[PDB]
């Protein structure tokens, strides 16, 4: 038996080595980290402190209001490890929209697009999101339940549990070097 | 009397004996029965060549392990997607008076990275293919991944589109989330457009 990493935050669970990694990802006593990806903010705090932190320390992150929006990522053929981030406001919540370009597999630059709720895991379960890329007679769609920012996105990226494509695919969908991602959030 | 210069059909070497004035050339050729087509089954094993109409018979007689499902909206189950031997899954779909070949391929296109590629091609011409769309959908616990495009024609083939990632492309990790007991169901819907 081993204690959870977040024991010092008030977590009581002791588990064997094999059950430890799964619990801590989903543990409630996990700190809410600055949800903006991926370097180099090291801020942590409570859920109610997240939106003010973004507003005070990440002023260039824009918000669009609506359930049905276009997240237009500019200059997607910019080389290397890039992030695009915006927030979407609907249903009384803010959602973090992230497009990340990273060399997850060696020699293969890929894009990962994912939505997170600024709120709890329990709250996140009432939502669904759709990410849709549109091209000339082409459409690529991903639909899932948004991750709570509590969980982060590193695990979903590693598991490809989000929309995954690459620079090859992106060319079908890009217009003037930009990528329009249709993001629809709905309740279930 | 000087008659005007005649042109042999571009499929003369395949047998076509008709010669024609230049204006009739394109109109005959894109209708000519002697046009050769390679075997559309992936990939390099079969060396058969023949007419468009000889294709589906070739697949029925020489590629008996390929199943044909009937209907515009089907499920293709790719079994044992995790087996190390497993490379290709092929199925035919019959609807709208045509036959469409669904191909799933597992490969390391980038070294060290195993990916699945899925695509549809029409047993027919590009012109015929351009009146269709196809949708591939993977379904899991609160997850859905969808790709929609115009079917490839068999003359163009699918190898080039796969190389370009102009098809459904996904990882072995996410394949697992969509798989049940080692099998991956792909919903395929063909539509007119
Ligand atoms: Cl809709
Ligand atoms: Cl799950
Ligand atoms: Cl439908
Ligand atoms: Zn814990
Ligand atoms: Zn921050
Ligand atoms: Zn001819
Ligand atoms: Zn053959």
CB B126 within 8 A of CB B154: no
Q: Which helix (H) or strand (E) is B162 found in, with range?
A: helix B159-163
Per the listing, tokens 């249903």 go with A91
- Quick one: B39 and B64 in the same domain? no
- Quick one: A15 and A81 in the same domain? no
Query: In the structure encoding, which two tokens stand for residue B114, read together?
Result: 């195993």
DSSP, collapsed to helix, strand or coil, labels residue B72 as: coil
CB B9 within 8 A of CB B18: yes
C-alpha pair distances (Å), A43 with each of A25, A58, A113, A114, B70: 18, 12, 23, 21, 57
CB A61 within 8 A of CB A151: no
- Quick one: B101 and B168 in the same domain? yes
Does the beta-carbon distance from B144 to A143 stay under 8 Å? Answer: yes
- Quick one: A22 and A39 in the same domain? yes
d(CA B150, CA A136): 10
- Quick one: B3 and B79 in the same domain? no
The residues on A that touch B, with CB distances below 8 Å, are 105-108, 128, 137-145, 158-161, 163-166, 168-169, 172
> Hey, how many other C-beta atoms are within 10 angstroms of the C-beta on A183?
23
Per DSSP, B52 falls in state G
A163 interaction partners in chain B (CB closer than 8 Å): 145
d(CA B12, CA B31): 14
Exposure of B26 by Cβ count < 10 A (0-12 exposed, 13-18 middle, 19+ buried)? exposed
d(CA B78, CA B87): 11
Query: In the structure encoding, which two tokens stand for residue A87, read together?
Result: 């927030």
Instruction: Rounding to the nearest 10 degrees, give the CA dihedral for residues A170, A176, A178, A182.
Output: -80
Range of the domain at B128: 60-193
- Quick one: A13 and A94 in the same domain? no
Does the beta-carbon distance from B169 to A172 stay under 8 Å? Answer: no
Instruction: Say which residues have a Cβ less than 8 Å from residue A44's Cβ, sequence separation at least 6.
Output: A31, A32, A33, A34
d(CA A121, CA B107): 36
* CA dihedral (A7, A13, A14, A16) positive or negative: negative
Per the listing, tokens 């507003």 go with A55
d(CA B54, CA B56): 6
* Distance (Å) from the alpha carbon of A87 to chain B's nearest alpha carbon: 22
Q: Is B177 left (phi over 0), alpha (psi -120 to 50) or beta?
A: alpha
DSSP, collapsed to helix, strand or coil, labels residue B144 as: strand
Q: Can you give the CATH number for the domain in which A13 is found?
A: 3.30.40.10
- Quick one: B133 and B167 in the same domain? yes
Q: Can you give the CATH number for the domain in which A83 is found?
A: 2.60.210.10
d(CA B84, CA B7): 53
Exposure of B168 by Cβ count < 10 A (0-12 exposed, 13-18 middle, 19+ buried)? buried
d(CA B117, CA A48): 43
d(CA A12, CA A18): 17
Burial pattern A34-52, b for ≥16 Cβ within 10 A else e, equals: bbbbeeeeebeeeeeebbe
- Quick one: B99 and B165 in the same domain? yes
Interface test mutation site (partner B, options A105, A133, A135, max chain B beta carbons within 10 A) = A105
Q: Is A92 left (phi over 0), alpha (psi -120 to 50) or beta?
A: left
User: Whose CA is closest to A6, among A32, A35, A43?
Assistant: A32
- Quick one: B80 and B55 in the same domain? no
Look at chain A and report how many structural domains it folds into: 2
Does the beta-carbon distance from A142 to B145 stay under 8 Å? Answer: yes
- Quick one: A61 and A142 in the same domain? yes
> Which of B113, B150, B169 minimises the CB distance to A137?
B150
Q: Is A148 left (phi over 0), alpha (psi -120 to 50) or beta?
A: beta
Whether cis (ω within 30° of 0) applies to the bond prior to A40 is yes
Q: Which residues of A are annotated as a binding site?
A: 4, 11, 23, 27, 34, 41, 53, 58
DSSP, collapsed to helix, strand or coil, labels residue B82 as: coil
Instruction: Rounding to the nearest 10 degrees, give the CA dihedral for residues B53, B55, B60, B66.
Output: -140
- Find residue B48's DSSP bridge partners: none
Resolution (A): 2.0
* CA dihedral (A180, B142, B186, B164) positive or negative: positive
- Quick one: B112 and B175 in the same domain? yes
Per the listing, tokens 């409630």 go with A28
């Amino acid at each position: 038996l081993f204690p959870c990493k977040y024991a010092s935050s008030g977590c009581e669970i002791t588990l064997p080595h094999t059950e430890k990694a799964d619990h801590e990802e989903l543990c409630e006593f996990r700190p809410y980290s600055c949800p903006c990806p991926g370097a180099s903010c090291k801020w942590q705090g409570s859920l109610d402190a997240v939106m003010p932190h973004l507003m005070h320390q990440h002023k260039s992150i824009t918000t669009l209001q609506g359930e049905d929006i276009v997240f237009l990522a500019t200059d997607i053929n910019l080389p290397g490890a890039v992030d695009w981030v915006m927030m979407q406001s609907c249903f009384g919540f803010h959602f973090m929209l992230v497009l990340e370009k990273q060399e997850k597999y060696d020699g293969h630059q890929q894009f990962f697009a994912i939505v997170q709720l600024i709120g709890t895991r329990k709250q996140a379960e009432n939502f669904a999101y759709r990410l849709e890329l549109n091209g000339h007679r082409r459409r690529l769609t991903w639909e899932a339940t948004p991750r709570s920012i509590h969980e982060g996105i590193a695990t979903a990226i590693m598991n490809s549990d989000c929309l995954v494509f690459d620079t090859s695919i992106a060319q079908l969908f890009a217009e003037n070097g930009n990528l329009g991602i249709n993001v629809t959030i709905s309740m279930c």
